[PDB]
Design a binder for this molecule. Structure first.
Ligand code: LGT
Ligand code: LGT
Ligand code: MG
Ligand code: MG
Ligand code: MG
Ligand code: MG
Lengths: 358, 373
């Protein structure tokens, strides 16, 4: 069979008090001439950690059959056995895992979505239109309308400030400005305690929001389950979880209507697929967090209509762009992820290492 | 209001006297373990107080731990050293996308341990007394350098030697393809040492459910202190089923890297003896949470590795614990653990009572520091 002969990893600081995002890129090449590209990231601390671990375990891939992806995921995990099956170690593993899936799809001359098997050619999308809790409503409404004009399918508004009546008034304003035909979601970013979340969720019910995201602390599964059980409005959460096991807990507690796994954060496509499988089984919906260039493919393979958020943050890393039209994000049709590194990455790369022969 | 003013971290690669080669090595799927990467943390305050802490990685993970610790370290400067759990949370939040387990929290654990060391010293108490102890000595055991592939006669001699020097029990590695072989080996050790020497076995996750069922059943009449890691570290339902059926205590947990994971073991009643590793779970703070959950569930404790730290933690547990004696980390420190009549003496010096040995500098590959002393 084929075998991995070369691997290169690099830490790229993408310029945007978040001033930059640390990206970990993984490049894998095989004796058969096949190639794959993958990545993971860290918004805050963690970039140097992911890279250092990735650099130490990369050699374990040399000589292995690229097609046995899950097997390799497990092998690299064992390479750092005392490091755990979550967190920084598996996120570093994720960059390689994504590269291998990219490579396999390309081997089949198919987009990642088609390799996995698709249910749709485009996915519903939304954005925050640069909106923040401190953004004047007037400014946000304008930016939101511009997004709808450009094809976005929904708007997610930040909420969770001490004065809840203010958030309610802000959402009412956007609803009036955009009309009942524009879907809206709110993200409390874990800012409410249980009683407040109960009161805020009850007030939002008549608004018919698509979902209320992270009303509680990321690990308060029982709290989230209680909210979901009681309210019609879907509860969304999961972006902070870093393993299939943590998502498994959410599902077991029925703490989320919309699961929000982040492939890079949970250790790559392999663990993401196991989470998606558990979610499908449990009858849940999917709303992947961040990294649309990767999640658009993963969402396309989910059986029930998902939502993917449009972000411009990572665009500069790649030559290709995502296309949006009429409230939906088009699933790329190029082989694999359909991504190649922009020449600009050269300037932002702070660390790099390679092993094997090309 | 004291404040942290200086922090120093270093990555020390400790050479091992003898390489560790498990089944994976013998089957040619991995290299023998010949060193351990230690992450050392030193914290100093305006009030002049000092603390030393550490974490470690057996296989890959050292560079990652150090790298992360270096990036979050400055977040300690200016903070009150006494608010330990608060600071644990703060550093965790500084790398919130990294999760609450694994490499990130193991890096945090090195600082956490230094803070506890510093608080104990501030009170002029050993860590054990700071927490409150239930005993001045803890039952101990060792492997006597025995491995699955060590000649039985040699293992028995070394084991007799350990007992002679005061060790209180012997843990034997089992789990090879041919189970009858493991049985005969335990039988020989039992015969060589006598009925009065406690014995435990470690399968190191090598059995599948049906095999574990059969081996545990054969081992019942041996009255072992415990059968450790008979299954995969995450097969909670399998461990619980074994524990429920057999009298012999089931021990596991050394591979877990967070309070939440140990919480899962306890919830499933997957272990009679919980084996948390403070460094691996994120330090003393998470360890204490685990111990409280364990005490409440009525379980027993058998901390994994790092005796220099776990001797203090075991002393603070209500029910009689077991701590394993290892000589691996000794070269790193000037102090030594005392063993007598089957128990290891809880150190009485302030804090953890550890000071870096002169040999540590030479083994230091990476280091950094922030703030001024
Ligand atoms: O859902 C989201 O994208 C937010 O919840 C972000 O992940 C958040 O951490 C932060 O990056 C932001 O943009 O407010
Ligand atoms: O219980 C133990 O100490 C063993 O299970 C070790 O942790 C093991 O990983 C290995 O280091 C060994 O000593 O065989
Ligand atoms: Mg969010
Ligand atoms: Mg509901
Ligand atoms: Mg063990
Ligand atoms: Mg039992």
């Amino acid at each position: 069979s084929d075998r991995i002969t070369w691997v290169r990893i690099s830490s790229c600081y993408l310029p945007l008090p978040m001033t930059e995002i640390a990206i970990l890129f993984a490049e894998i090449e095989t004796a058969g001439g096949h190639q794959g590209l993958g990545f993971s990231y860290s918004k805050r601390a963690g970039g140097p950690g992911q890279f250092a671990h990735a650099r130490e375990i990369a050699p374990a891939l040399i000589g292995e059959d690229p097609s046995d992806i899950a097997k390799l995921w497990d092998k690299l995990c064992w390479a750092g056995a005392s490091a755990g099956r979550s967190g920084l170690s598996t996120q570093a593993i994720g960059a390689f895992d994504v590269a291998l899936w990219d490579l396999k799809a390309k081997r089949a001359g198919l987009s990642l979505a088609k390799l996995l098997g698709s249910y749709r050619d485009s996915v519903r999308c939304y954005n925050t239109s640069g909106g923040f809790l401190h953004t004047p409503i007037d400014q946000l409404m304008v930016n939101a309308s511009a997004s709808i004009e450009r094809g976005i399918g929904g708007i997610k508004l930040k909420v969770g400030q001490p004065d809840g009546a203010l958030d309610i008034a802000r959402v009412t304003a956007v609803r009036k400005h955009l009309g009942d035909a524009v879907p809206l979601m709110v993200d409390a970013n874990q800012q409410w305690d249980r009683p407040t979340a109960q009161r805020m969720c009850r007030i939002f019910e008549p608004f018919n929001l698509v979902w209320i995201e992270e009303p509680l602390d990321a690990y308060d599964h029982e709290g989230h389950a209680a909210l979901a059980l009681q309210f019609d409005t879907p509860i969304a959460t999961g972006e902070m979880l870093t393993s299939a096991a943590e998502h498994g807990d959410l599902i077991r507690h029925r703490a989320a209507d919309y699961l929000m796994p982040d492939a890079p954060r949970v250790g790559g496509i392999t663990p993401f697929l196991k989470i998606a499988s558990l979610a499908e089984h449990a009858g849940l919906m999917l709303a992947p967090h961040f990294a649309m260039e990767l999640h658009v493919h993963l969402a396309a393979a989910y059986p029930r209509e998902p939502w993917v958020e449009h972000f411009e943050w990572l665009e500069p890393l790649f030559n290709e762009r995502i296309e949006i039209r009429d409230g939906r994000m088009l699933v790329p049709t190029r082989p694999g992820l359909g991504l190649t590194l922009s020449g600009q990455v050269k300037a932002w790369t702070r660390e790099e290492a390679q092993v094997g022969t090309r």
